[PDB]
Design a protein around this ligand. Structure first.
Ligand SMILES: *[C@@H]1O[C@H](CO[C@@H]2O[C@@H](C)[C@@H](O)[C@@H](O)[C@@H]2O)[C@@H](O[C@@H]2O[C@H](CO)[C@@H](O)[C@H](O)[C@H]2NC(C)=O)[C@H](O)[C@H]1NC(C)=O
Ligand code: NAG
Ligand code: NAG
Ligand code: NAG
Length: 410
């Protein structure tokens, strides 16, 4: 469509191959990416330039990821910034080498708590809230229900370890005490026995879905369920995770009432976003584009990530026209330190309303919203939301319920 216009090239890094489990995120977010790019092209928002997104398959592999990045630099056009990075290890290797290349990176799916280190990854940004974002939200929930004595059950895996350790920092001046800290790698039954021995009533769990069935099976035999107990665990599990299989009836008896915590895929506010669409109008539109592609909960973040990139380039263009004798953006060979500086500062100024809510960074980290769910009878039900920017907890009244006439005591 754009004949005389120079391209603003972006290096899209993600697993796209069907030969890799995580390639579904890449493929699932592609319709959202195309929707933001079609509108940017139709209305020519980068006039007289155009958005040139180039895609490179990381294949969710460390070696392959690094080769795709280097091949993109060597034989590809002049990329102004990096868009993507899904698998934690692949994103960490690439992000480590950005400053040397004058390349600002924006990820929509890499949730690892590790990438928060702006001493190691100074040129890395992300629209998606990190795994640690659940902690301030959890802290707000505990104070709301006067649960000042908790116990923690963590899986001995980096993903979960990093979240549990960040929790120690979050609870500093807070009137909350972790009367018990338990760990496990293969079997949680021993740690659950210990929590019951220590008389723990409110449990903060950090483990995968396979381990969750084991935890709830142990909880049943140890009587750690019902009216006197409250489990707070990851909300990102698969709809029928428990159906994938103690007996299944006992597993459900121990599951009943548990609270799920995860990031909110899309905002519930009916406000017009930066695109000029509401999060609900974008969702229906996204659903027509996918055409059975399968849904990714990171689609909203990817859509917003493209809008962050376009607004960053719009700001970068304004700055360059203000600085005489050097405004040839299309010419950026990775040498320009000043160009990277301008892009970096322009992304740090991001503050707009996206499909995933208010898009704001705090040292390259997203200030987003956290979703609270509860397992009632046969499915998880949305029981509230946490706003990171405002530090606001809003519990949907007449949804969250307890086994007794009132919430359990700590
Ligand atoms: C990186 O950005 C922060 C935040 O920028 C402010 O908030 C944005 C959402 C947008 O509204 C901008 O126009 C704002 O300036 C900048 O830090 C804040 O600066 C204010 C004013 O001096 C200060 O009172 C706050 O304490 C600052 N907050 C922090 C966390 O430093 C910051 O200067 C930017 N950094 C660079 C290197 O450009
Ligand atoms: C892009 O333009 C076409 C005009 O043919 C229109 O059908 C479509 O809705 C537009 N998409 C966006 C996202 O504005
Ligand atoms: C970028 O432009 C400079 C300035 O002349 C040149 O020395 C360098 O080789 C260029 N890089 C590429 C990849 O062409
Ligand atoms: C829940 O209670 C809070 C605090 O009083 C109130 O602001 C909010 O409107 C309530 N929500 C519903 C659905 O009642």
């Amino acid at each position: 469509p754009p004949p005389s216009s120079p391209p603003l090239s972006i290096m899209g890094l993600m697993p796209l191959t069907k030969e890799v489990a995580k390639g579904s995120i890449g493929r699932g977010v592609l319709p959202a990416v195309e929707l933001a790019i079609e509108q940017i092209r139709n209305e020519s928002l980068l006039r007289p330039y155009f958005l040139d997104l180039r895609l490179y398959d990381t294949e969710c592999d460390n070696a392959k990821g690094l080769k795709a990045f280097y091949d993109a630099i060597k034989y590809g056009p002049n990329h102004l910034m990096v868009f993507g990075g899904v698998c934690p290890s692949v994103t960490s290797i690439i992000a480590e080498s950005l400053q040397g290349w004058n390349l600002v990176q924006l990820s929509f799916a890499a949730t690892t708590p590790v990438l928060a280190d702006k001493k190691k990854y100074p040129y890395f940004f992300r629209t998606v809230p990190s795994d640690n974002a659940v902690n301030p939200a959890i802290l707000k929930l505990l104070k709301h229900y006067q649960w000042k004595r908790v116990g923690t059950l963590t899986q001995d895996v980096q993903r979960f370890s990093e979240v549990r350790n960040d929790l120690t920092g979050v609870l500093y001046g807070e009137d909350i005490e972790i009367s018990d800290t338990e760990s496990f790698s293969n079997d949680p039954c021993t740690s659950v026995k210990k929590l019951k021995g220590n008389d723990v009533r409110i449990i903060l769990g950090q483990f995968d879905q396979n381990m969750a069935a084991k935890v709830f099976c142990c909880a049943y035999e140890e009587n750690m369920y019902g009216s006197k107990y409250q489990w707070i665990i990851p909300g990102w599990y698969e709809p029928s995770w428990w159906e994938q299989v103690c007996l299944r009836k006992n597993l459900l008896a121990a599951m009943e009432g548990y609270i799920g915590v995860d990031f909110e895929p899309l905002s519930s506010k009916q406000i017009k976003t930066i695109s000029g669409k509401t999060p609900q109008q974008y969702e229906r539109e996204y659903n027509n584009k996918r055409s059975g592609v399968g849904p990714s909960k990171f689609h909203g973040y990817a859509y917003d990530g493209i809008w962050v990139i376009a607004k960053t380039l719009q700001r970068a263009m304004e700055t360059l026209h203000a600085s005489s004798r050097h405004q040839r953006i299309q010419d950026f060979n990775y040498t320009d330190h000043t160009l990277g500086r301008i892009i970096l500062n322009a992304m740090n100024e991001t503050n707009f309303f996206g499909v995933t809510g208010q898009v704001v960074f705090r040292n390259g980290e997203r200030m987003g919203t956290i979703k609270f769910t509860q397992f009632q009878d046969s499915r998880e039900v949305k029981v509230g939301e946490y706003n990171a920017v405002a530090d606001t907890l809003e519990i949907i009244n007449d949804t969250i319920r307890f086994q007794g006439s009132e919430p359990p005591k700590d």
